[PDB]
Paper text:
In the cryo-EM map of [name], the densities for K+ and one of Cl− ions are absent. The corresponding N-terminal loop of [name] (residues A65-N83) is also bound in the same location with the same mode as [name], consist with the sequence conservation in this region. The N-terminal loop of [name]/3 binds to the intracellular vestibule of the transporter, arresting the transporters in an inhibited state. In conclusion, we solved the cryo-EM structures of [name] and [name], which display a distinct configuration compared to NKCC1.
Numbering used by the authors:
A (entry chain B), B (entry chain A): 62 to 83, 96 to 936, 1006 to 1010, 1049 to 1116
Write the structure that this text describes.
């Protein structure tokens, strides 16, 4: 078709990434390289053995929790694909560009260790097929002709595993273009072998395949060694013994001295593969765990037993178990039969729509190998009987591969068909592993690896091959599948767990550039799949899971330390520099800030001619209001230029540092040399903070001695600060008589705290006495609430809503409604009428109706010129001082500033007549955009 | 003494904390309440049993790793004591005030669960002594008189454990003052019992205590049930059988039909406690692990064995094992014998020097119980033989407590002496546990617990007693020591691990208010002790350690979520708000910032009359310089007041947001409405950032069209910015021809980058071309280095140091030394001469000499008026443009600004003649306080 001349199941790596600085639909580029790294030697060498030991409903469940593991990791990888633009280079560049260089050096290094131990599991599966089924005469170590054949079997896999690994790691050094060419014969040998196996089980429902086994009375024998079973060889006229007699008795002379189990029992011959038609699921759907050295023993037979001490004599031709078996041992052997799901992203800079091919091409290439493994375990447990399943190496059927004796041609279709694919999977993983190590050490995220990025011309790793040919050597010296198999399955389960974790902590915390766009992500499938990866990590080996999880987390913190040492300059200083910046960039997203207002505060203090703070008691009121929580920035302004008044600001800086550590204030300090104090104050209200760590209110003193002279632009700077916060939508706390405010160890014995509503923000006016009584100074004071009502309304019902609001919150205050009818209150009500419904649009976008419009007053209660007739607060101040003149703290809402600046001094002498004969006052001012629904 | 009338080993709790808002030396207040909660029932009921099974050198090692665990946790608790002022209230307030409310609600809640399961381990030890040694006739359940006595033993501990727990949880509800009075009889019963046991082993070296056991030929018998052993009862004239015969044979008729092991074997009588003098350490220093149901079998005897199938008949009077035993089972039973180290901080608001009593009073009260347990295991394995150690409940010695048969009076000194102390330890822990739950729910850190802080008058918990009397019930229904014992030992190991971890991550990261002042802290002892707590957590039960560690970490994140929901207002927004603030407060400590300078940058951009950025190519030069790393703040200034020009700043804000996301800039934006641009720029240079997240350099354009007119205060604002950064010690990058600078996808094919030194900062001048070539635009350009030398020096050697500097760093540049002799260079050299040695004091406090003064040039190389004779850069510019006129980027150090402002326009036309006929120039300016030793 001339498009299949570019098949290439190999991964891209580093060379196709650097050349993208300056064709493959779904089937040929994603789906087929994924259905070629998934199918492997466990399907042809171990899946019959685990269904004979676990049975169905224990193999059926371990193929259902090992496949539902990798299905949920496949969803999390499809979110990484549909995030950015899918860079060219493979799976290392596609993950570490959407999860950061820390979650990419840890997934990227647990993956190189997984495939370099998979590459030892394929060379181990090569010599198993070459020594047990192809050529069992090349075996160079024959131990003693005794029961000590286990050690010579291991020492034969160590001299041939080394000789194959040397020749395999020198084919991919000179013949890389040839191994790329031969990638289509490997996919054919896999796909032909699976079609052969499903072929013969449809033939078996009509014609069974005729493989016979021989039982010495409920004991399975090894057919290698004798010809005909029969025990007698009747032969016609005279009878002479068989060769089966010659292995159990003293000689072939027919006289005497045979052994005891041989003499009291007969022999039998049954069909080892009794077709799919025989009702063999029933007597094969339960477990049969065995111990090392146990005869396999077909159940349901006669077997007169010796009932003696059983000197079983491990030299007779029996079939013994070679290892003890249980459920959690089988999961670590079966698990590498589902790995290979990062192969759908091998060719990511070759597709035409890589955000559509990588999702559907790996979800379908997983759901179709699940339909093979689930249907193989039912059909193997309905066509073969148990004692032929329960031995590997096929001793009951004369040295034939047990899955091979089910194919439509002779069993050499599967024996050669598995020999080449296990050779072409260890040639693949010995190229894809030293490519990924070369891709890691070019990025420089791990600085000691940096000589494993060197190559020859045209890429093609030269030193990373030498390291991979030594790590794969120590899986050859172990020399056993069922030992190398659960080791690599821990490394693959580790990297599938860090992928699932990183994609779930970023959707919750809302990291900035992360959009999955997939369709079915929902953040919990990546969390539920993480909960299955470490569950399966524990039941393979908890002493393996606990050490592969610790050094993965100990290279995560080596990326962050070395990455911050070059980003900011020094190491341990940079970890906190990087943690603050990343938390700030997370804040700027776009959704609104908060639906429960909390004063952040920005304290404006004044210093004097030798730079000491003028009123230090303003800083102790912040300590009694914040109690260490939130943000607090203190700011002072000097006059002059920076160029010659800067040492006057070095020591004005440290005098607020030394004083906010003595009044126990937790926050930051900013000292600014402006040319005048009018705009230098106005700057700090604008640029206070960094990003989302910005202030919310201003706390400033009162401009006392304003009326005299010689401070003429001090009270004109005050009224311009009231207008700058109404336009900037901040809030305002101004404290009159700052020197009368208590220090930290003074502790008012009793008394009260009065609040006056009038007709404005109560959520801001009930929260401030609430927060004050969490301090040891204001703990013992009561709290009385005075609200001013007009008339023509009711008030009688207004106080009822006030009482249940305190009942629903347990504040234990008391209310009293004072009433005006004439123009006593007009600086509050007259100038604005629409704020009642202007407040409503602030709470309509708030989107809370179910029991959240309760626990929030103001709304539950809502039920003649400044210039020289004007506003008069004498009738208002006379009713305030009649009931609050000795109350330790009064809280008032101050009225809104006038429009035209011709009434800027009629406004200041409204605030003096309002608050006369009152000792400690604190005037508040709203901003409209404050709701408080939960009172801490 | 009338000071011992205030002994009170009970903990303080919540009442003594709220009353400290408004006498006990070391021995009586720390040391003795610590030597009373440590000594317990494992010393009297299980320590003999574990030394008979493990032997010495396996009991010797598990008392050495369980005591060295709690010794290192005792050091970490002595750092918490010598940090603040040691508040009043106990151990909950002392930890959660120096480790935060998150490491205090997790240590504080794993501790309440530990003592409420210790309180079930004492009521279980009460009914064991009352049913096996005191009154073995109160047993209300007698099963079948068969081998099914294990179930009736458990059902007898469930009806008496419930009846004692009801009466114990109603003594501490009405008689709390009496239990406080009786705390001195409990310390006496403990201290008298230990003096009794060490007494009898000195008597045993001269007089053994005479306790006899009887062996049926290598089989230990149960002496309860028969009187004299002897098997015959010769009696004088006629012989009639014993009662030992009557338990093994059919009747007492002397005829026949006895059992087979009884008939072929004799009986024997040996001393069960053969003194300290017998050489019995040898035949007792090795393990003897047994299985459930095994006869104990004293080794080294004759014992003609049956060699048959052994119908052992578990109804004969034998001594059988009741459980199977191994090494990691014994650690979970032995471990609660060292807990009780938080008792030295029970009375913290009662001492006189609490920072000196709590260290020495718990270190010595741990080192002296280690001398008891280490010396008990040697002396128990030299005075008792193995088959009396290897049975609990004392069946071989006729129902006597095995540690009781070693005391100087009759063994009832230990039997009553342990009955009262285990009763006074379950009365203590049933008061200290519902006090700590009441201390937790007053703080409000866990909001659903808040009804367990309610009390009656005078404190004294009323509902927390009801919860503790139901959690302790489910340790009564388990009804077995050796089952409740490893459960509580997991909770105590959990809280000792979070204490050790929190004290090691704060010393490394340098959290602000943390000073240990102790003497021997060194941060690694708290880390090495953490490495032993979770090691011991795994070898008790890994399926218990894995679930007690998960819900401890799942209340840590419940403290942080609910604590940030009230600190900032909304929940998941506040986690990132709190993480940014805490990382910023960590930065302000006092040590200097960095010894490897990295440009942080602060870009000053200009907008126009409809608020679009004037030169957008200044923002792409930051992307090509930072590449996403570090901090970058862009700042623009408008003219006017805030009160009417603020919507002009809303949309000037979003036009830099929409443009710094398109040029791929990562950072923050600040727009400021000043009254003039001179001080509004000067403010941003001062207050740029928050805390330690502040800028380091300024990147600004060039004031083109300065010479004409109508922009007269634009170039006067420029030269004032050069002086404001020299005084403020910042650094400066000014770019000429900003529109000629390349965009992001333009990718220079080849070319060069030239740099000219002259005679100043090269660390800042080699780092900027280094960082530029990490981008795809400047990757392919070369890098030539031109340095200007004077004369009378050498230069010949200067270029040699330049070449090895690039050899030691692999930059692949080339150098060339151009030379001047006359006054060509005088704007650089003439005005300042002392900067060579002024630089030296900057690097003397740097404190780096060992190979760090290499890899840092500038120092390795150091080997006539401005006003209208002046400075002339025509001879300098003619040699620049001869060699660099087509070089894609030139870098120059600009000279220092003049002192007097009369030469402010002779300075600007020095910068125009210096940089004429050059297309892309970038002038740099130092600051003195920049060293770069590692070039990324
Ligand atoms: C049973 O064993 C005896 C050995 O004692 C066999 O006896 C000899 O067998 C050889 C075999 O060729 C003959 O040449 C001898 O003549 C036999 N000698 C005697 C004394 O019998 C005997 O043949 C064996 N039984 C059978 C049936 O072969
Ligand atoms: C071994 O096989 C033989 C078959 O020849 C069994 O012999 C038969 O046993 C049954 C049951 O006792 C008898 O009814 C038949 O008459 C026997 N057949 C002959 C030809 O004699 C023998 O029982 C089997 N052994 C065991 C232990 O089952
Ligand atoms: C194979 O034969 C043995 C006898 O040699 C069977 O074992 C006996 O099994 C029964 C089952 O109830 C027990 O009661 C006997 O005690 C066993 N006897 C001995 C000597 O162990 C065995 O069951 C057979 N195998 C299978 C799979 O059934
Ligand atoms: C051995 O057992 C026999 C029972 O068969 C005993 O014989 C009887 O024992 C009773 C016991 O008092 C006598 O009254 C009978 O007279 C005995 N009868 C006979 C026929 O002996 C016998 O006594 C037992 N052996 C001994 C030594 O007591
Ligand atoms: C049980 O104890 C008796 C002691 O009466 C042992 O009998 C002695 O055995 C030794 C060794 O055979 C002889 O030398 C003595 O003569 C025996 N003593 C008498 C009085 O006959 C008897 O051996 C012991 N049983 C076992 C199994 O050791
Ligand atoms: C108690 O006696 C038994 C015999 O009843 C001893 O067991 C034998 O131990 C030897 C040791 O080498 C073995 O060779 C035998 O096979 C054992 N016999 C049986 C029947 O098990 C046993 O050793 C004695 N106990 C101790 C602690 O020594
Ligand atoms: Cl994979
Ligand atoms: Cl403790
Ligand atoms: K497979
Ligand atoms: K103890």
């Amino acid at each position: 078709l001339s498009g299949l001349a570019n098949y290439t199941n190999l991964p891209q790596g580093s060379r196709e990434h650097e050349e993208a600085e300056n064709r493959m639909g779904t089937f040929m580029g994603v789906y087929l390289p994924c259905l070629q790294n998934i199918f492997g030697v466990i399907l042809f060498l171990r899946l019959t053995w685990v269904v004979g030991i676990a049975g169905i409903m224990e193999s059926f469940c371990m193929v259902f929790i090992c496949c539902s593991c990798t299905m949920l990791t496949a969803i999390s990888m499809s979110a990484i694909a549909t995030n950015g633009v899918v860079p060219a280079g493979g799976s290392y560049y596609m993950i570490s560009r959407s999860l950061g260089p820390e979650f990419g050096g840890a997934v990227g290094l647990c993956f190189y260790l997984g495939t370099t131990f998979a590459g030892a599991m394929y060379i181990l599966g090569t010599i198993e097929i070459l020594l047990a089924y192809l050529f069992p005469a090349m075996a160079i170590f024959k131990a003693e002709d005794a029961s000590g054949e286990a050690a010579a079997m291991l020492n034969n896999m160590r001299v041939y595993g080394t000789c194959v690994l040397t020749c395999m790691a020198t084919v991919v050094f000179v013949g890389v273009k040839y191994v790329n060419k031969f990638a289509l014969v490997f996919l054919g040998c896999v796909i032909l072998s699976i079609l052969a196996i499903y072929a013969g089980v449809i033939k078996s429902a009509f014609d069974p395949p005729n493989f016979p086994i021989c039982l010495l009375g409920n004991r399975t024998l090894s057919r290698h060694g004798f010809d005909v079973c029969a025990k007698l060889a009747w032969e016609g006229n005279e009878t002479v013994t068989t060769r089966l007699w010659g292995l159990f008795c003293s000689s072939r002379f027919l006289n005497a001295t045979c052994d005891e189990y041989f003499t009291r029992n007969n022999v039998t011959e049954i069909q080892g593969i009794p077709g799919a038609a025989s009702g063999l699921i029933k007597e094969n759907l339960w477990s049969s765990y065995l111990t090392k050295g146990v005869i396999v023993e077909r159940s349901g037979m006669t077997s007169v037993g010796l009932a003696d001490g059983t000197p079983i004599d491990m030299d007779h031709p029996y079939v013994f178990s070679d290892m003890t078996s249980y459920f959690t041992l089988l999961v670590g052997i079966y698990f590498p039969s589902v790995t290979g799901i990062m192969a759908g992203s091998n060719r990511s800079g070759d597709l035409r729509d890589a955000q559509k091919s990588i999702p559907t091409g790996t979800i379908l290439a997983i759901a179709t190998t699940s339909a093979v493994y689930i249907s193989s375990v039912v059909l193997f447990g309905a066509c073969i009987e148990g004692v032929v399943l329960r031995d590997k190496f096929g001793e009951a059927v004369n040295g034939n591969l047990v899955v091979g004796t089910l194919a439509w041609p002779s069993p050499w279709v599967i024996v050669i068909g598995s020999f080449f694919s296990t050779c072409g999977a260890g040639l693949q993983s010995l190229t894809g592993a030293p490519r990924l190590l070369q891709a890691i050490s070019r990025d420089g995220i791990v600085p000691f690896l940096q000589v494993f990025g060197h190559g020859k011309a045209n890429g093609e790793p030269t030193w990373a091959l030498l390291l991979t040919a030594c790590i794969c050597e120590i899986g050859i010296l172990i020399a056993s599948l069922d030992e190398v198999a659960p080791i690599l399955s821990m490394f693959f389960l580790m990297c599938y767990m860090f992928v699932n974790l990183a994609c779930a902590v970023q959707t919750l915390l809302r990291t900035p550039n992360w959009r999955p766009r997939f369709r079915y992500y929902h953040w919990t499938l990546s969390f539920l799949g993480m909960s299955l990866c470490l569950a399966l990590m524990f039941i393979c080996s908890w002493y393996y899971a606990l050490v592969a999880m610790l050094i993965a987390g100990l290279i995560y913190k080596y990326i962050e330390y070395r990455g911050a040492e070059k980003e900011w300059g020094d190491g341990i200083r940079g970890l906190s520099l990087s943690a603050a910046r990343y938390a700030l960039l997370r804040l700027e997203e776009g959704p609104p800030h908060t639906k429960n207002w909390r004063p952040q505060l920005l304290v404006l203090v004044r210093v004097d001619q030798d730079q000491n703070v003028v009123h230090p008691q303003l800083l102790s009121l912040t300590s009694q209001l914040k109690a260490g929580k939130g943000l607090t920035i203190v700011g002072s302004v000097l006059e002059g230029t920076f160029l010659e008044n800067h040492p006057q600001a070095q020591r004005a800086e440290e005098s607020i540092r030394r004083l906010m550590e003595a009044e126990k204030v937790k926050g930051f300090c900013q000292v600014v040399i402006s040319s005048n104090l009018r705009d230098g104050v106005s700057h700090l209200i604008q640029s206070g903070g960094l990003g989302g760590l910005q202030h919310n209110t201003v706390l400033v003193g009162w401009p006392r001695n304003w009326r005299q002279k010689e401070d003429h632009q001090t009270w004109r700077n005050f009224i311009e600060l009231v207008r700058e916060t109404t336009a900037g939508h901040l809030a305002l706390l101004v404290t009159k008589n700052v020197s009368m405010f208590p220090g930290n160890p003074e502790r008012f014995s009793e008394g009260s705290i009065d609040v006056w509503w009038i007709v404005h923000d109560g959520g801001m006016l009930m929260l401030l006495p609430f927060l004050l009584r969490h301090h040891k100074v204001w703990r013992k004071c009561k709290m009385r609430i005075f609200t001013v009502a007009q008339m023509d309304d009711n008030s009688i019902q207004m106080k009822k809503d006030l009482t249940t609001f305190l009942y629903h919150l347990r504040i234990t205050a008391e209310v009293e409604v004072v009433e005006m009818h004439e123009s006593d209150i007009s600086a509050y009500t007259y100038e604005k009428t629409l704020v009642m419904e202007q407040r409503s649009q602030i709470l309509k976008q708030m989107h809370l109706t179910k029991n959240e419009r309760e626990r929030e007053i103001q709304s539950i209660t809502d039920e003649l010129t400044w210039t020289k007739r004007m506003h008069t607060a004498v009738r208002l101040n006379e009713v305030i001082v009649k009931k609050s003149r000795d109350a330790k703290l009064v809280l008032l809402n101050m009225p809104g500033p006038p429009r035209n600046r011709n009434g800027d001094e009629n406004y200041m002498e409204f605030l003096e007549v309002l608050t006369e004969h009152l000792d400690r006052v604190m005037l508040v001012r709203g901003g409209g955009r404050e709701v408080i629904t939960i009172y801490s």
